[PDB]
Amino acid sequence: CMERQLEAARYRSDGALLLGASSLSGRCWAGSLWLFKDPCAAPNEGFCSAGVQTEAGVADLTWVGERGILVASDSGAVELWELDENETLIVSKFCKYEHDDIVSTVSVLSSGTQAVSGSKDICIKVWDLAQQVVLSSYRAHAAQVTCVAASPHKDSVFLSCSEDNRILLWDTRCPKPASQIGCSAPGYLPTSLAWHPQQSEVFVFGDENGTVSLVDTKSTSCVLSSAVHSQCVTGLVFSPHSVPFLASLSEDCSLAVLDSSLSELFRSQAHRDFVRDATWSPLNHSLLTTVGWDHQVVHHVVP
Amino acid sequence: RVSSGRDLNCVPEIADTLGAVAKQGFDFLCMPVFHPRFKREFIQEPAKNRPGPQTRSDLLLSGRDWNTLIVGKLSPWIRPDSKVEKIRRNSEAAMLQELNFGAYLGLPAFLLPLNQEDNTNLARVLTNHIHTGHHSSMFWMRVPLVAPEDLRDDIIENAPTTHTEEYSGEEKTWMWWHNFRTLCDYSKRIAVALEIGADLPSNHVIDRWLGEPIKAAILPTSIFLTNKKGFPVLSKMHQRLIFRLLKLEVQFIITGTNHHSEKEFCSYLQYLEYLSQNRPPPNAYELFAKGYEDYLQSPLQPLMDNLESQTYEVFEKDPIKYSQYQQAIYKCLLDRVPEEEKDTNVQVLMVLGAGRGPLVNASLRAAKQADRRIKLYAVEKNPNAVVTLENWQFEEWGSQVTVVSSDMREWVAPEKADIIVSELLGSFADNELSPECLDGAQHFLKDDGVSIPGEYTSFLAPISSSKLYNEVRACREKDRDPEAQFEMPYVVRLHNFHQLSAPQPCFTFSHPNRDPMIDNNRYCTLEFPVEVNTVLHGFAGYFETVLYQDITLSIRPETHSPGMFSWFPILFPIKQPITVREGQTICVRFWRCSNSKKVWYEWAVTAPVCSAIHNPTGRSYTIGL
Amino acid sequence: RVSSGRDLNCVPEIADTLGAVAKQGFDFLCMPVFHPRFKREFIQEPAKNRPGPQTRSDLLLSGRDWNTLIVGKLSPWIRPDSKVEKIRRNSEAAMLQELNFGAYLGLPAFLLPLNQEDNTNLARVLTNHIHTGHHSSMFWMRVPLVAPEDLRDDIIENAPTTHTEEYSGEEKTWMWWHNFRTLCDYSKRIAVALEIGADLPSNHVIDRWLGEPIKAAILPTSIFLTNKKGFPVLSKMHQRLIFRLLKLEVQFIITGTNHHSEKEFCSYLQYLEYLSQNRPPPNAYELFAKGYEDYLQSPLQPLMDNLESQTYEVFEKDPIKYSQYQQAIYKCLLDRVPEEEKDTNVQVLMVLGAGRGPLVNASLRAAKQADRRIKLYAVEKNPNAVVTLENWQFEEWGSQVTVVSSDMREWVAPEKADIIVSELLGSFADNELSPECLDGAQHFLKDDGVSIPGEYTSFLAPISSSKLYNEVRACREKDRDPEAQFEMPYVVRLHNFHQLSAPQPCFTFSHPNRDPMIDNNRYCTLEFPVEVNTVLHGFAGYFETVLYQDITLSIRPETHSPGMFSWFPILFPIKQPITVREGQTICVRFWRCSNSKKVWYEWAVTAPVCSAIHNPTGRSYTIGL
Amino acid sequence: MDNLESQTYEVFEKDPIKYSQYQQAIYKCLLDRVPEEEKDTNVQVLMVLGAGRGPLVNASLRAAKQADRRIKLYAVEKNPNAVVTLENWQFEEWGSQVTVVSSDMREWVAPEKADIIVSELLGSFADNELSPECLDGAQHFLKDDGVSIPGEYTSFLAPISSSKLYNEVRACREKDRDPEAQFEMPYVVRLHNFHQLSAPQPCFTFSHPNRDPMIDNNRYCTLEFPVEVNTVLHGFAGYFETVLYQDITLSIRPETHSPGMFSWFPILFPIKQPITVREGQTICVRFWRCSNSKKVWYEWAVTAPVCSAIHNPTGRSYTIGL
Ligand SMILES: Cn1cnc2ccc(-c3ccnc(NC[C@H](O)CN4CCc5ccccc5C4)c3)cc21
Ligand SMILES: Cn1cnc2ccc(-c3ccnc(NC[C@H](O)CN4CCc5ccccc5C4)c3)cc21
Ligand SMILES: Nc1ncnc2c1ncn2[C@@H]1O[C@H](C[C@@H](N)CC[C@H](N)C(=O)O)[C@@H](O)[C@H]1O
Ligand SMILES: Nc1ncnc2c1ncn2[C@@H]1O[C@H](C[C@@H](N)CC[C@H](N)C(=O)O)[C@@H](O)[C@H]1O
Ligand SMILES: Nc1ncnc2c1ncn2[C@@H]1O[C@H](C[C@@H](N)CC[C@H](N)C(=O)O)[C@@H](O)[C@H]1O
């Protein structure tokens, strides 16, 4: 049986669907992890490939390679779950209690051997996944860390953002690893991040007020911006196309899809609660899957 | 033993978690009452219509467990002071919702953070909650010694942490608490959960919190060090603060995960227990005072009222006051009658205000210690104690002691005294009219006669203390001036307070007083150099007295008579708190005033700003002649 | 176990005597504080200058012994109301002297007699004492059921005892207590030590003392009878009074010498213990109420406030209310769906104000008892209980129960009801706005739909009780009308009181109410025949309700639902007590009033005299819509 | 909750500017809604919401034979005592052109919809007589393209110094209530012995009609008043401005005050304790408008250069009855 609040949806390269969800109300506050080789069968538990209960809720997750699942837990743990040989069990590889508060965000760095986590405890941590240890611990921020995002191609570079209003570009090769970046004037709080998968120099960020903006790291200047949403922007997900489209999800319960100049191509009101994640099919590049706290798994068709 | 809770921000199952932490040793648990990640919408559809339940059920704990074991926590996404209107309105409504739920549940406390400068709207919402109905939870505001922004790693290349020290800046969080608490008009329901950091800030930043209503101190696991054998312990400097916090008596709260994997959570706890086991034991004074900290008493009306038998009982047990008197009487006897006169010379000794007789006995012990001879009068105005006295001189003293039932200002003495002995002293020395009483008695002391005490002096010190300011404010009564509480002094065992400058002498009286024209009125100006930032709430008074020569009594802290519990300090409030800054001078003015019927004090602060003149005319407070 | 003291008027040695009586079983001792025969002079010489001591010393007992074991007695020569001036002045001064001494000593009580009609000056002196300082003794006025003059042997030839009975005369001593207590302005510090005689007076003389503040009952040895084996016992009629006095809970006092020489003093005591061992055990109701007698509660603001979880908890334990509801729902189901329709017909049942769900469960039990089928809505305005409810319908009820979070006056119902079920009732029936609430809900009951309750009726009875009059008076607050306390009703477990006439119906409401024009305002006149003399202090309210057909709930004493503790009576005070005489009628008038925001009651007595109209405009008390 | 007295309507009916300003607004609106070719064919439905003794009904009538256009009038009034004056007006004078309606505008079931609603429900702080709540519950009977007159209003605040007024407030202590309540309610006062410390700044703004998807009349606002003298702060003078129609306005803001208009004095919002302000400091003040279903109130607090207590929390000392 599956808890109502769907937190995460990610396609594997082979087309199978990883699902994360928490119980955010009722007697038991926990979470679970699900694998759905039939993605159209989501989220019925009987018609799943694998599935397991976690100690506490899942605030975030990400695929590690092809069989690993890296989880941001309410408990302060970062955990790594391993997919079965058959891929019919999901087995705990490590549970490490290193954060002092809810771990809110997690991301795998380019070479698949390290990860960065972000916490309400205001810390950012760099993990050796093979070693199951915290390599580095950074208190750069002054309020809870909202999102960490690895660069596509460099193991020492990642974005982070906090309710302390700072967007930070990181580079563990420098003596002083973080460097504050963003728009001319300090605007609204940064709530979501995604690197451009082609131009490894550009990213987008979403704010608390529903604006999506495009940033050059080179210009240290905000290129374009658009008011996409009427509420906070919780996720930004680029399509796997040559010229990638950008999926935009929100607490206004809608999904939008925008082109590279950030114009609206599509919008979906299908959800009736917060939209928590988007994931593009590796197979059908026009098929896009969103999940939300309504416990709906919706497969969209994008022009 | 310490009282301590566990702070958690993750609770999968309530029954399990409560058990686990109770096993570990904790007295209570701080947890979310809604899931910390469960952002609710109150206005926009469809999110607003989210099917319930909105949280987990009250049935999961007994009514008693809720009332004694659980401290609520505001959900961390609730931001009433956000610059985004919609977030401001969901937060306003969600804060109400969570606060109403804690009240429904009967929770004894509830935590809310001050984690930024502007908390106006949080303050307004909470004030509004406080003034809605009849619920009982304390509110603990989670404030750090050091702001998060001033605590960060210096690891941002283009945003360095500012190196040059700012005396003010490092007190920024006291001002967070101060403004918040002012906004909410000093509600007795709002207290401090002070969060202690790995790096302590400077003394001065920490002292700042002296006299604030600290109900709990939050210790992250991360601030603990590791000893030889792997156990958690604290730095020397952290220990000093633990001791000050134990002395104050607060509840400790452990927060964060186990950073000593070798042992369980009870290890942190056992260190705190170790610390309190290891502090000094209560001295004799501290044991007497134990129940009385910041408890406010109306001072005795010494003349218009008669003390109760049990009041004489409690103070007769003073292990220092009477043996000090004996020693004064002893030294005086020798000085007045030479060895050759010893069996020829009989000293007339009068005890003025003899109570149940201890100073009469002390006199008697002084005579067969000096080996000299004395005739005793025991004068007492309280006819009820006169019963104890007259039963003493029949069964014991014999005709050596002449018991006299009357006022010393009234008595027609058969002969003159060599020595008058009295203890007519209150905590501000002369606040029981010892001057007026001994003045009207002195006509029967021989021209070369000694008074014991020979003199006394009162002292004043400015103080900070929100707690006491609030205890006074709460003393408002029906059918009198709504501000009278502030225009009278209180005998109080000052405990949760900060003394802002060293005590300075105020009024002085000498006995006998053969001033051609006797005047007991006084006017005095005091200038108190202050070297911290703070808020002034009143003046602690104390006193010193010269019994005889070098034999003294004192409640001035610097020269306090050890073991002597007979007097607590006195507190003289002011109607309105006054902000004082580093390096400023507090100027205060006291008058002693009288007419034929009564005596009173009037006071006013004149710098760094003026207060109203307090108690003009004895309008709120007089001492009856 | 009883709490009892010994009354003595002779104490040679205090330590001995205290011991002796403690041995015998007594909890405390009533004794002189000065020698009863020791007439003192305060004005004329030489008598005035009598060398002391004036009495024995406080040192003879511990402070604790004084506070817990000794009750003072006024010296019997003290006669403040004598017609001889000099005696009047020595008495005034000696009464002060003895009273000051009891206060000095910290005595918990002190006895003074009312042994004659005129006690004005005694009253004045005592009043003056009460308003001097801060002392704590109760004053117990020793009054007999029967005056000594009405008790004498008829053995004076030329002064016969008057044979013809006088209804009034035999109540002369109640009027002694009444005037005295009025003089002293009802001080909460003055209570009754009622002296029981060998011959009881008539019932009516004794009932007179119903609702007075009796703190002790004094039993002379002389009134006890002797049984077969020589032990002391009491007449059947005396036992009845002992039982009423135990029920009231007072302290017993044995007075006089041992008139059963065969045994010791503990024998009298052991009989009293025997008596209280032998009374009925507390029924379920009496056990719930145990801590609540004459304790005054502000009634719930049912709509503007949300009940706390522990409040639902306490009342969910009612062993009768819910099983009565179940039985009403049961009978209704059968009446609406025939056996042939049983599996075809699904009744729509709405619980309006569902709290934590007990009436939803009772509905469910009623359905598989009637063996019929139902669809349930659970409406609740209190979002905190809605949490309990929504956790119930996920874990248990399933889609058979639709939980609805809103006000019943607000809800847009998807379908119409066959049956609405509610318990929105306060102690005066409609004082929680059940009428207004069900009125605005009824538009969704089908044309042939049943409301449970179908109707309710409130009832009123006039009462006597100085104790409650004083509890109300003491409810004066700062910052509001100084008489508001009297212009609002109180939920109270009426205990020390006398009910003056039988309850009479007041307001009645029916549901549904398809009155063409609905009006919930009411005006009613009641005439209460009174057959005793007494003083009126207020009106006890009660109620009855028809759940379904013959299934009822009631807190009217005559028809009280057994075991049902969910409602205490309600009290409606009047500002000023009113004297009523044998055979008079008390007339009272109640109005129920409203506007769109609130509902309130206004009341006035119109006979035998008028009171002021109480609570005009809801100036002191409204019930928020 | 109260009904005005006859003499109160009398005094203000004598305002030499307020009504002729209304007439001019009604005039301009009529022309804008009905073209010359429609003039004799088009009859505008005009509703006066809160009609008092009829001056805005007459001003409407004068506006019609000034614009030379044709109108049907409703005169709604909740005060049954003024309704007596009104119904005696429409018998003796107005005739069936004016339909007098005795009820609350929030309550009335209107037979038809309005082209134009006309009202003056304004107090010295604009919205302090519940004009928003009143026009909100009335708007369902304004046609989709209907105009409200006023179209909008805005309140303004300025900090003030004045020991005299501080003392007048202090002296307002009453028996049987909070001894500090005097300070937690505003006063209509012709401010005279006082010093205004900074220029007035806009506070709350309301628009009519308000077809906000979700209507919310609550408000929270922060104002920063630059002060360039040394002084002591004792309270905030409030004022207001309103857009009747287009460029036709009323104002009691000193800088833009409507000349001759005496119908409103300023409002005063005290603080419990005076606050010392120094040359070059900023006074920061915060106002909230609050409500529930029964009442509306204001709560305020100073946050710089020091904080005051939050005033009037919960409407504990002062509410405006719905
Ligand atoms: C802690 N404590 C326990 N019982 C107390 C009774 C009175 C007081 C009390 C009340 C108001 N003022 C004072 N302090 C000033 C007095 O002058 C203290 N002296 C100390 C010596 C003394 C000796 C005999 C009789 C009375 C006294 C009182 C004490 C404190 C008590
Ligand atoms: C003896 N006791 C112990 N806890 C109490 C809480 C409230 C009250 C209380 C306070 C004011 N008025 C009342 N009585 C009138 C109420 O309508 C009684 N009903 C009885 C049934 C009921 C069921 C659920 C929730 C509340 C109630 C309240 C009781 C009494 C309590
Ligand atoms: N003017 C006065 N004349 C006579 N007795 C006084 C006067 N003023 C105060 N007293 C008594 O002086 C005593 C003062 C007490 N502080 C000392 C009691 C006793 N000497 C002792 O040390 O225990 C009280 O018993 C007062 O009643
Ligand atoms: N107008 C209303 N609409 C909805 N609920 C109401 C209304 N008035 C009162 N209530 C609720 O009705 C319940 C009344 C209680 N006396 C009964 C609780 C529950 N039925 C029980 O017997 O335990 C309370 O929980 C109120 O909050
Ligand atoms: N909700 C309401 N419904 C109907 N009348 C109202 C309402 N609120 C206020 N009023 C009336 O509106 C009038 C407002 C006055 N300021 C104006 C009087 C008149 N229009 C004039 O200018 O002289 C008063 O007569 C109020 O009684």
PDB file of C-alpha atoms and ligand atoms in Angstrom, chain D residues 2-4 8-9 12-13 18-19 22 48-57 76-80 82 101 103-107 118-122 129-131 133-135 138 264, ligand 5:
ATOM      1  CA  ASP D   2     -26.365  53.262  15.410  1.00  0.00           C
ATOM      2  CA  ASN D   3     -28.735  55.597  13.645  1.00  0.00           C
ATOM      3  CA  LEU D   4     -27.697  59.209  13.120  1.00  0.00           C
ATOM      4  CA  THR D   8     -26.522  65.462  12.486  1.00  0.00           C
ATOM      5  CA  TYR D   9     -27.912  65.175   8.939  1.00  0.00           C
ATOM      6  CA  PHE D  12     -23.655  68.230   7.186  1.00  0.00           C
ATOM      7  CA  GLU D  13     -26.357  68.868   4.558  1.00  0.00           C
ATOM      8  CA  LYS D  18     -19.496  67.811  -1.097  1.00  0.00           C
ATOM      9  CA  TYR D  19     -22.842  67.590  -2.853  1.00  0.00           C
ATOM     10  CA  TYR D  22     -21.294  64.589  -6.331  1.00  0.00           C
ATOM     11  CA  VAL D  48     -28.399  56.048  -3.890  1.00  0.00           C
ATOM     12  CA  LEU D  49     -27.143  53.624  -1.245  1.00  0.00           C
ATOM     13  CA  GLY D  50     -27.486  55.257   2.174  1.00  0.00           C
ATOM     14  CA  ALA D  51     -29.721  58.135   1.128  1.00  0.00           C
ATOM     15  CA  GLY D  52     -30.043  59.929   4.502  1.00  0.00           C
ATOM     16  CA  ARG D  53     -32.510  62.833   4.201  1.00  0.00           C
ATOM     17  CA  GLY D  54     -32.216  62.980   0.354  1.00  0.00           C
ATOM     18  CA  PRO D  55     -29.520  65.536  -0.690  1.00  0.00           C
ATOM     19  CA  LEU D  56     -27.689  63.003  -2.953  1.00  0.00           C
ATOM     20  CA  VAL D  57     -31.076  62.101  -4.441  1.00  0.00           C
ATOM     21  CA  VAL D  76     -32.022  53.042  -0.097  1.00  0.00           C
ATOM     22  CA  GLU D  77     -31.605  53.910   3.631  1.00  0.00           C
ATOM     23  CA  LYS D  78     -31.220  51.670   6.678  1.00  0.00           C
ATOM     24  CA  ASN D  79     -32.100  54.361   9.199  1.00  0.00           C
ATOM     25  CA  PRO D  80     -35.922  54.199   9.464  1.00  0.00           C
ATOM     26  CA  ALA D  82     -34.463  59.316   7.937  1.00  0.00           C
ATOM     27  CA  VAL D 101     -36.382  51.684   0.068  1.00  0.00           C
ATOM     28  CA  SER D 103     -33.415  48.536   4.414  1.00  0.00           C
ATOM     29  CA  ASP D 104     -29.768  47.710   4.653  1.00  0.00           C
ATOM     30  CA  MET D 105     -28.010  47.756   1.249  1.00  0.00           C
ATOM     31  CA  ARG D 106     -26.367  44.414   2.162  1.00  0.00           C
ATOM     32  CA  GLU D 107     -29.895  42.981   2.583  1.00  0.00           C
ATOM     33  CA  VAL D 118     -24.044  56.466  -5.583  1.00  0.00           C
ATOM     34  CA  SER D 119     -22.962  56.533  -1.914  1.00  0.00           C
ATOM     35  CA  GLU D 120     -21.206  58.518   0.683  1.00  0.00           C
ATOM     36  CA  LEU D 121     -20.271  56.030   3.394  1.00  0.00           C
ATOM     37  CA  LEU D 122     -16.921  57.545   4.222  1.00  0.00           C
ATOM     38  CA  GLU D 129     -17.390  53.373   8.342  1.00  0.00           C
ATOM     39  CA  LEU D 130     -17.322  50.074   6.501  1.00  0.00           C
ATOM     40  CA  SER D 131     -17.979  51.529   3.084  1.00  0.00           C
ATOM     41  CA  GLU D 133     -18.155  45.905   3.358  1.00  0.00           C
ATOM     42  CA  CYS D 134     -21.328  47.847   2.574  1.00  0.00           C
ATOM     43  CA  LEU D 135     -20.646  48.386  -1.132  1.00  0.00           C
ATOM     44  CA  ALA D 138     -24.507  45.687  -2.607  1.00  0.00           C
ATOM     45  CA  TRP D 264     -14.764  65.665   7.875  1.00  0.00           C
TER      46      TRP D 264
HETATM   47  N1  LIG E   5     -25.321  49.140   4.782  1.00  0.00           N
HETATM   48  C1  LIG E   5     -26.127  50.231   4.684  1.00  0.00           C
HETATM   49  N2  LIG E   5     -27.339  50.150   4.099  1.00  0.00           N
HETATM   50  C2  LIG E   5     -28.161  51.232   3.967  1.00  0.00           C
HETATM   51  N3  LIG E   5     -27.848  52.441   4.449  1.00  0.00           N
HETATM   52  C3  LIG E   5     -26.670  52.666   5.065  1.00  0.00           C
HETATM   53  C4  LIG E   5     -25.731  51.537   5.229  1.00  0.00           C
HETATM   54  N4  LIG E   5     -24.655  52.033   5.863  1.00  0.00           N
HETATM   55  C5  LIG E   5     -24.888  53.354   6.098  1.00  0.00           C
HETATM   56  N5  LIG E   5     -26.095  53.729   5.632  1.00  0.00           N
HETATM   57  C6  LIG E   5     -26.663  55.099   5.675  1.00  0.00           C
HETATM   58  O1  LIG E   5     -25.843  55.893   4.794  1.00  0.00           O
HETATM   59  C7  LIG E   5     -25.920  57.282   5.129  1.00  0.00           C
HETATM   60  C8  LIG E   5     -24.493  57.821   5.024  1.00  0.00           C
HETATM   61  C9  LIG E   5     -24.310  59.322   5.226  1.00  0.00           C
HETATM   62  N6  LIG E   5     -22.880  59.550   5.341  1.00  0.00           N
HETATM   63  C10 LIG E   5     -24.782  60.136   4.013  1.00  0.00           C
HETATM   64  C11 LIG E   5     -26.155  60.785   4.167  1.00  0.00           C
HETATM   65  C12 LIG E   5     -26.613  61.408   2.833  1.00  0.00           C
HETATM   66  N7  LIG E   5     -26.303  60.537   1.700  1.00  0.00           N
HETATM   67  C13 LIG E   5     -25.901  62.721   2.729  1.00  0.00           C
HETATM   68  O2  LIG E   5     -24.877  62.855   2.001  1.00  0.00           O
HETATM   69  O3  LIG E   5     -26.354  63.610   3.467  1.00  0.00           O
HETATM   70  C14 LIG E   5     -26.457  57.293   6.544  1.00  0.00           C
HETATM   71  O4  LIG E   5     -27.743  57.893   6.538  1.00  0.00           O
HETATM   72  C15 LIG E   5     -26.522  55.819   6.974  1.00  0.00           C
HETATM   73  O5  LIG E   5     -27.615  55.529   7.842  1.00  0.00           O
END
